[PDB]
Amino acid sequence: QLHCSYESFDVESGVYSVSSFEAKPSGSVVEQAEGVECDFSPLLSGTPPQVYNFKRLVFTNCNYNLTKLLSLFSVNDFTCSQISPAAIASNCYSSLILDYFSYPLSMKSDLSVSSAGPISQFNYKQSFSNPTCLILATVPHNLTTITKPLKYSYINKCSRFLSDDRTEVPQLVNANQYSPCVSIVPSTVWEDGDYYRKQLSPLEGGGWLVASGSTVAMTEQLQMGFGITVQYGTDTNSVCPKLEFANDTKIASQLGNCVEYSLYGVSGRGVFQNCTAVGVRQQRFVYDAYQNLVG
Amino acid sequence: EMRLASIAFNHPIQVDQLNSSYFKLSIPTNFSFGVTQEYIQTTIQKVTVDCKQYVCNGFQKCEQLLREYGQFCSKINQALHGANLRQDDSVRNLFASVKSSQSSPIIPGFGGDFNLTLLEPVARSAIEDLLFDKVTIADPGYMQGYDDCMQQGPASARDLICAQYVAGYKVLPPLMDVNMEAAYTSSLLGSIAGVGWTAGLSSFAAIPFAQSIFYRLNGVGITQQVLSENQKLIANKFNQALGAMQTGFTTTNEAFHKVQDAVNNNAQALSKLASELSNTFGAISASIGDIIQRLDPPEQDAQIDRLINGRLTTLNAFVAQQLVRSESAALSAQLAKDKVNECVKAQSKRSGFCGQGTHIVSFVVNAPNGLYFMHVGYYPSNHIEVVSAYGLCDAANPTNCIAPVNGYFIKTNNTRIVDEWSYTGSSFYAPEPITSLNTKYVAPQVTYQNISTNLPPPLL
Amino acid sequence: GEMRLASIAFNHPIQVDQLNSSYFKLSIPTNFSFGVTQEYIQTTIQKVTVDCKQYVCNGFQKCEQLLREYGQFCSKINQALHGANLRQDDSVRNLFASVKSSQSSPIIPGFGGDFNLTLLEPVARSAIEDLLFDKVTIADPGYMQGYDDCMQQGPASARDLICAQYVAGYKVLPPLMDVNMEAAYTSSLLGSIAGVGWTAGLSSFAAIPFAQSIFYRLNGVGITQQVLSENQKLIANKFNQALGAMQTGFTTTNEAFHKVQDAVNNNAQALSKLASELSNTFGAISASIGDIIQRLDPPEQDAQIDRLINGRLTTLNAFVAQQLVRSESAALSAQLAKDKVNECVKAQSKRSGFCGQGTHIVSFVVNAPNGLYFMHVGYYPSNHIEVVSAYGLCDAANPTNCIAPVNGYFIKTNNTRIVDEWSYTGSSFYAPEPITSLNTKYVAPQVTYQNISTNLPPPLL
Amino acid sequence: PGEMRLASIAFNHPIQVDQLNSSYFKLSIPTNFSFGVTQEYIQTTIQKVTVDCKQYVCNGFQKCEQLLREYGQFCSKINQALHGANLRQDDSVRNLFASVKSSQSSPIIPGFGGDFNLTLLEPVARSAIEDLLFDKVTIADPGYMQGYDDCMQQGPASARDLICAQYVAGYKVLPPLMDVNMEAAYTSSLLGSIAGVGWTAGLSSFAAIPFAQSIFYRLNGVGITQQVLSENQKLIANKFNQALGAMQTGFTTTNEAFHKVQDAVNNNAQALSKLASELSNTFGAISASIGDIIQRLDPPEQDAQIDRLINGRLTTLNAFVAQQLVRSESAALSAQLAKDKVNECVKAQSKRSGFCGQGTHIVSFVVNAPNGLYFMHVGYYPSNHIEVVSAYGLCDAANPTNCIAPVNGYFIKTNNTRIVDEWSYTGSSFYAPEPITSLNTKYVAPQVTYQNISTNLPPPLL
Amino acid sequence: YYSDDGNYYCLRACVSVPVSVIYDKETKTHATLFGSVACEHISSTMSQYSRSTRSMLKRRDSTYGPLQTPVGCVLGLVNSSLFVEDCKLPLGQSLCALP
């Protein structure tokens, strides 16, 4: 390496530095769980919502096997952003969040995290502060507890008319939130091009709320869409894949080499020692000013 | 409330110029010893950088990505090695002037009545240890090393030296060896007594310290007669100035402040490097392993590439900063060498250099990353004005003209001298009879006084 | 006409042929003139600070939120600039500590007798300092009236970067030194004159006429006292002619003067570089933040703002680094000035090198913007002649009676007033005189000393 | 070879000499000496270069010419900065040489210095020593004349000079301000400025005395007595020549001053070579060549790739200017140091220590070197030190007001069989007793440590 | 390159000629230097070319040949063979350039 560093077959005499030893770390241990098997059973029945009626599940403190969940539907589109599609199943988080709604494959052009479509203008937006994913799927004929809407439908307008009846200002949907027009729009759109208006009070700042929507024909088997996002916390990272710990060795002490670890889904590598306590209790993790875990 | 105030301007004592053959002369009637101090940094701490570990920690995707940039690291390592070599050169060059061909042995009770707290506790010195205790620097490297990182030590360690083994930093040991350094400073004390008795560049006088002091005092125009009368007084005033050094290690002492800032600058450079390990460049995480675990490899290395590039950029900035500091230290080291070969090895007539009180012997001790100088100096006080003449002549014979050597001719104000004129030393008010030892023959001049009666030099 | 190719001239030294044996050719000037040289030593960098919020953006809320992510860069910038300014003020205090004297002469009109002394204050600064300030092209001064000279209550023709200071968020810190106190310090140095002689001068103050201190210095370079007494008015005349040349000294061919002007230019350039960057896009749609806000939907708006902010921060970082380098070079330059005050000014020097090249005789210093301006009086030899000279002389009747000249030479006499075959001369000027005990000392005998068989007064026997 | 050996660093202890009680003391004095030489290299300049700011960036391809207009003001800043740096380098040379020249000098002849060898004399020219230096230097051949026609196809295929690569990069290497022959004449004048050295500061007078005579004057200037010098005159010249002759073996890599010259040469070479490598440095652009990206790209795409290539090229030029400014200033400071050494280490003997060679001071010499000046300092090295008894002074016991003390030497108890007197005088620089006489002493005020002499002193006789 | 005629040929790419000018602001006149290229490649007009015209030189240099110097070939410099200490426009070496 010294010769390569100087590009020569005869290095001048001296004392010179070379790269450091890697220090041979021990095989990994974990502090993940206790918890209870995830409860994704709400997904097994009923009609999924129109895109502005979203149903959401949020999980904490629990253990899961998403591939068993995935086996229940046929997925015709799986993509993700800021995470590999495999790693979202393997990673422990402070929460697991799933949004679900009905969605025809005939409208599939309007759903991406980057879409400019009316689905994203007024019915759904996803934050990029979290690494969520997406799924388009259909229901197998043996899922009889699943039911379907008369038509698939969405809001294609949501704006407020100025009190002088000329100027109008759009109300785009907030990331991870329902648009304000949901208070006047019907649970499904009865006919394509239906629209509604609400006069607004001086307490509301005046003007008229205006909203409208569109519909798509029903299909023999229900089509569905999902939005999935995750949240990384610090001492709240209780959602993980079911443990593989059975048939292994006692954990976590080795003391020992600077062994790789995951504690409640927080990856890292290092050696532990039985030192004294510092405050404060129940925050779990302790850190320095440089964002390095201390203990 | 804070008070607005004018900045004071001290006015010099005014002395009126006078017309004709005589003039007003200002002379001090008291004095005090005093000291000043300086810190001359001579080195930058020497460090090296593992250029693989700073960027990434053996992940295999980054190892392959890093290869496209491998020549930058080679430039980085080479630049750092050259900077460290220059630091070693300055140390050896300094020590070459520090050493002497010969020296006195040193024992307790050296310097007689002078207190000499600087003597080693045979050792370094109590003064050097006070400096080391006042400095707030983190606990030293090398031994025990690795066990101040590792769990076989206190949980309360906060040393950046443990972080040295995370970041891949290496602190090189100083070349000088603190025990050899102490030997070198004692060798300088052994050259004392002394610098006088001609150039001193061959011979070694080997005389008592007090004798060399009296010689230096006579070298600034204090008469020998005064020196013999006040010998105990001189030692007492000298020791008072020396005793003040125990209060000298304070934050208002600017030389002390500079020592602490030299330590702060070395620590600061490393702390900047440590903080950059956590600095994302828009990357999803500062950890390479974390972004690998979360991403498919075609996407994964877009994140890795951004992270690598910013990390390389901070290394480049760091190297440039070190090169600049190394050069300034080399220049500062040359200044220290000059002072050892001027302010310490000899009494000087230049003013300027050394503490501002004429010059009398100065001393130097070890300080972290440098030398700390202390300068004894002479401060005049209680100035009075006297009548003085440019010279004297024989009124009966105009070619008999004299003028004082290393002193002045003043009208006498003393009851023991019958002669109307008296010789004085130039450093202190001390009138005495005019004799051939204190005067020399000179060419005649119109301003010399014409003496018509009693002048002993020449008698006729 | 067409430009002309020419050789660079090489002035040859006057050749003096070496001679063998016990005697030698000696070159001595027969004329001289006073003359001057000047130097400018910069001691400081103008002190400035930067509002790090206003340089980047100007109260728009969106950029303030964006800036918070980078707020620690500004903290680093402000601290670095603050430390740079502290160093500049340290150097001022350290310099002034050597400038001050424990005692000085009062200074009145007509000081220096026959010497003209245009440097005296108009009791004040000095006429010479004011000529320097008038020749300098520097922009009108800050502080008062300041901010209201930016404002519409003034002429439309103002073009000061100082008004632009209140747009850019720049702050120019005032100098520590206070120009009135500074003028007092230069007069204190003039009060230490007359003088440096009569031993080290580090305790006592001689308090003698200026002319007397000049004669002392002239005797200090080997000019005989007898010559000095005969030429006193001539010396004053030549000296005043050299001083009078200072009125033509403020020209562009004077390099010290040129350096003063460029120190001023360098400070102005640092600020103008900064002003131009306010309009520099980094590929942003506009240099104005408010304009891109007005024209853009907010999800796209801060892409443009981000590009703009990062380029603005980068120029501030480069700017600080430039100032740190300049501050360090000024500190070193200030140390040099201090050395000259404690050497070239406070004493006559025998070193050559330092001061103007004409041996050394008294030098002066005056205030200059951002520094000190030195002037050096010097002695220039002319009309050299060659003469016969000997290493020493000794009585031929007694080989131990040997003498050699002190600060001068023994030359064969060419003068009709001296009956003696040999004569003493000063080393700075041709001035033969009788050899007497005052100008000689006894030395050990040497083979090259001349064997004088007749009349020698030192020793008479 | 076997295994490496760990070893302690040796510490050379100073010779110990005891401090002593009462009126007399041990004195350490050398009994032998030798001449020796030390040397220094002081760089004074940076090579002056300029850069065509269009040619470095592009080869005149038209798409670049259109795009470059957006950045034309950067180039002006680059050119101005380099021009000012080069101006400063020329001014420093002129400033230095103004103090180098002497108003008068001895003619230089063969056989100068008598018995001294003087290999520094010109081959009437430069000097043999300067030629040894220039041959040891590894620097590439100069341009100008014939210049370019050594770059052109009518020449060897083996040239690899950065100097002919100058015509590819848009580089210009400016010529040095002075012709080498004038520079040699400036140092010839310095050789002829020796003697006078003594007889006051020498500032205007020219003593014109033989070089050997000036050496003896200098030896009395360091306290060597005249009697010794007259006895050893041939010996002194021989020891001096042995030290001088060693300069022919001094040009090795173990000579650190020589090593600094070698580094100065490669600091200039390194700066130029960096930029040659940057011509091939793509910035992620499709190719580092403009013509390649033109030939492989549709013009809407092509321009984007050109701009990316331009941005990195300008960035390296900016970095280069910053590098040059730093180097130029350090050279100016180094040149100032050289100027002071010419006016102290060379023009006159000095008592300072520190500066010049580490052996007191005796004459030093300076020669031309690439980018700088090279100094040699002759010095005096003491040897074989002995301890002797010495006294602070002597006085008449019968007349206590008669007190004397030695001048440029010390009173010692005599150890010599030719001196009947119990006390003797020796010079500060060397051990060699002599009778105490009025020439070697001065009257002083009485002091209690002076010896009370009850017998015989000739100064005063009574 | 090895040609398919079996002969090695070598390639030096191509070269450019550096140029500099002498500007006398006091008289508002100028002259130029082509450096190391030498006057064997210099002609009254240029076929290469560095700028759209050379005519500013031609205002006086229509009447003069190129002049070789130790630094290089020049236009309009004139051989006056004068000796001057400082021309305020030195060309380096022993060359100088009087106004």
Short mmCIF file of all heavy atoms in Angstrom, two decimals, chain C residues 1-11, chain E residues 29 60 77-78 80 82 84 94 96 98-99:
data_model
loop_
_atom_site.label_atom_id
_atom_site.label_comp_id
_atom_site.label_asym_id
_atom_site.label_seq_id
_atom_site.Cartn_x
_atom_site.Cartn_y
_atom_site.Cartn_z
N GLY C 1 7.12 58.29 -31.86
CA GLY C 1 8.07 57.31 -32.34
C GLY C 1 7.80 55.92 -31.81
O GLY C 1 7.14 55.74 -30.79
N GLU C 2 8.35 54.94 -32.52
CA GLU C 2 8.32 53.55 -32.12
C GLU C 2 9.08 53.36 -30.81
O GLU C 2 10.04 54.09 -30.54
CB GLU C 2 8.92 52.67 -33.21
CG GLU C 2 8.11 52.69 -34.49
CD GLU C 2 8.46 53.87 -35.34
OE1 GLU C 2 9.26 54.67 -34.92
OE2 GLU C 2 7.89 54.00 -36.40
N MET C 3 8.63 52.40 -30.01
CA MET C 3 9.29 52.07 -28.74
C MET C 3 10.67 51.59 -29.08
O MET C 3 10.87 51.12 -30.19
CB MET C 3 8.54 50.97 -28.00
CG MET C 3 7.11 51.31 -27.67
SD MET C 3 6.96 52.69 -26.55
CE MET C 3 6.66 53.98 -27.75
N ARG C 4 11.64 51.76 -28.19
CA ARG C 4 12.99 51.34 -28.55
C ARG C 4 13.57 50.26 -27.66
O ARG C 4 13.57 50.36 -26.43
CB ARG C 4 13.89 52.54 -28.55
CG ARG C 4 13.55 53.52 -29.65
CD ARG C 4 14.36 54.73 -29.56
NE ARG C 4 14.07 55.45 -28.33
CZ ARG C 4 13.02 56.27 -28.16
NH1 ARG C 4 12.15 56.45 -29.13
NH2 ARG C 4 12.86 56.88 -27.00
N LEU C 5 14.10 49.23 -28.31
CA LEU C 5 14.77 48.17 -27.61
C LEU C 5 16.02 48.72 -27.02
O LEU C 5 16.75 49.46 -27.69
CB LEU C 5 15.11 47.02 -28.55
CG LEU C 5 15.64 45.74 -27.92
CD1 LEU C 5 14.53 45.10 -27.09
CD2 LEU C 5 16.09 44.82 -29.03
N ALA C 6 16.33 48.31 -25.79
CA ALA C 6 17.54 48.79 -25.15
C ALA C 6 18.07 47.76 -24.17
O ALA C 6 17.32 46.94 -23.65
CB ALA C 6 17.25 50.10 -24.44
N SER C 7 19.36 47.79 -23.96
CA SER C 7 20.00 46.95 -22.98
C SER C 7 19.72 47.47 -21.58
O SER C 7 19.65 48.69 -21.39
CB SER C 7 21.49 46.90 -23.22
OG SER C 7 22.14 46.17 -22.22
N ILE C 8 19.62 46.59 -20.59
CA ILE C 8 19.53 47.14 -19.25
C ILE C 8 20.93 47.53 -18.85
O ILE C 8 21.85 46.71 -18.92
CB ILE C 8 18.96 46.16 -18.23
CG1 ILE C 8 17.55 45.77 -18.61
CG2 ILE C 8 18.98 46.78 -16.85
CD1 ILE C 8 17.00 44.65 -17.78
N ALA C 9 21.09 48.77 -18.46
CA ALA C 9 22.39 49.25 -18.02
C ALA C 9 22.86 48.55 -16.75
O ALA C 9 22.07 48.25 -15.86
CB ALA C 9 22.33 50.74 -17.77
N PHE C 10 24.17 48.36 -16.65
CA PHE C 10 24.74 47.86 -15.41
C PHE C 10 25.75 48.87 -14.93
O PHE C 10 26.79 49.06 -15.56
CB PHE C 10 25.44 46.53 -15.62
CG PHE C 10 26.03 45.99 -14.35
CD1 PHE C 10 25.32 45.11 -13.55
CD2 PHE C 10 27.29 46.39 -13.95
CE1 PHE C 10 25.86 44.63 -12.37
CE2 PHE C 10 27.84 45.91 -12.77
CZ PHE C 10 27.12 45.04 -11.98
N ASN C 11 25.46 49.52 -13.82
CA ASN C 11 26.42 50.47 -13.31
C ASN C 11 27.56 49.75 -12.68
O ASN C 11 27.36 48.95 -11.77
CB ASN C 11 25.78 51.41 -12.34
CG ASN C 11 26.75 52.43 -11.84
OD1 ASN C 11 27.36 52.24 -10.79
ND2 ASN C 11 26.91 53.50 -12.58
N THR E 29 0.64 54.31 -27.14
CA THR E 29 1.16 53.51 -28.24
C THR E 29 1.54 52.14 -27.74
O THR E 29 1.64 51.91 -26.53
CB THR E 29 2.40 54.13 -28.89
OG1 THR E 29 3.44 54.18 -27.93
CG2 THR E 29 2.13 55.53 -29.41
N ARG E 60 2.39 51.30 -37.66
CA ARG E 60 3.77 51.69 -37.88
C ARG E 60 4.56 50.51 -38.45
O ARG E 60 5.53 50.71 -39.19
CB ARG E 60 4.42 52.16 -36.58
CG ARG E 60 3.76 53.35 -35.90
CD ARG E 60 3.86 54.58 -36.72
NE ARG E 60 5.23 54.97 -36.95
CZ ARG E 60 5.62 55.99 -37.73
NH1 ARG E 60 4.74 56.72 -38.37
NH2 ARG E 60 6.92 56.23 -37.86
N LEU E 77 9.83 47.07 -32.12
CA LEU E 77 10.78 47.39 -31.05
C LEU E 77 11.99 48.22 -31.34
O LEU E 77 12.47 48.83 -30.40
CB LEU E 77 11.28 46.13 -30.42
CG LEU E 77 10.52 45.70 -29.18
CD1 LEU E 77 10.79 46.71 -28.07
CD2 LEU E 77 9.04 45.67 -29.51
N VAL E 78 12.53 48.21 -32.56
CA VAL E 78 13.69 49.03 -32.99
C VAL E 78 15.03 48.71 -32.28
O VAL E 78 15.16 48.81 -31.06
CB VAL E 78 13.36 50.53 -32.78
CG1 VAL E 78 14.57 51.38 -33.11
CG2 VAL E 78 12.19 50.91 -33.66
N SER E 80 17.82 50.19 -30.91
CA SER E 80 18.54 51.43 -30.61
C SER E 80 19.90 51.22 -29.93
O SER E 80 20.70 52.14 -29.85
CB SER E 80 17.74 52.27 -29.67
OG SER E 80 17.72 51.69 -28.40
N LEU E 82 20.69 51.29 -26.91
CA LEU E 82 20.85 52.17 -25.75
C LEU E 82 21.03 51.43 -24.44
O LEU E 82 20.60 50.29 -24.30
CB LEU E 82 19.66 53.11 -25.67
CG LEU E 82 19.58 54.08 -26.85
CD1 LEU E 82 18.31 54.90 -26.75
CD2 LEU E 82 20.81 54.97 -26.85
N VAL E 84 19.96 51.69 -20.59
CA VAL E 84 19.12 52.40 -19.61
C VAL E 84 18.82 51.56 -18.37
O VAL E 84 18.52 50.37 -18.48
CB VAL E 84 17.79 52.86 -20.28
CG1 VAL E 84 16.91 53.55 -19.25
CG2 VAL E 84 18.10 53.83 -21.41
N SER E 94 18.20 40.78 -20.25
CA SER E 94 18.81 42.09 -20.39
C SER E 94 17.99 43.03 -21.30
O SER E 94 18.42 44.13 -21.60
CB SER E 94 20.21 41.95 -20.94
OG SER E 94 20.18 41.41 -22.23
N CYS E 96 14.89 45.47 -22.55
CA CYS E 96 14.29 46.57 -21.84
C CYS E 96 13.42 47.19 -22.99
O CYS E 96 13.70 46.92 -24.18
CB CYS E 96 15.46 47.56 -21.43
SG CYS E 96 14.93 48.51 -19.93
N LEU E 98 12.22 50.95 -24.04
CA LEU E 98 12.03 52.35 -23.85
C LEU E 98 10.77 52.94 -24.47
O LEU E 98 10.43 52.62 -25.61
CB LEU E 98 13.19 53.10 -24.44
CG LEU E 98 14.49 52.88 -23.73
CD1 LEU E 98 15.60 53.57 -24.49
CD2 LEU E 98 14.34 53.42 -22.33
N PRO E 99 10.12 53.87 -23.76
CA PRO E 99 9.06 54.72 -24.21
C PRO E 99 9.60 55.70 -25.20
O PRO E 99 10.79 56.03 -25.16
CB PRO E 99 8.59 55.43 -22.95
CG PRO E 99 9.80 55.50 -22.10
CD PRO E 99 10.57 54.26 -22.41
#
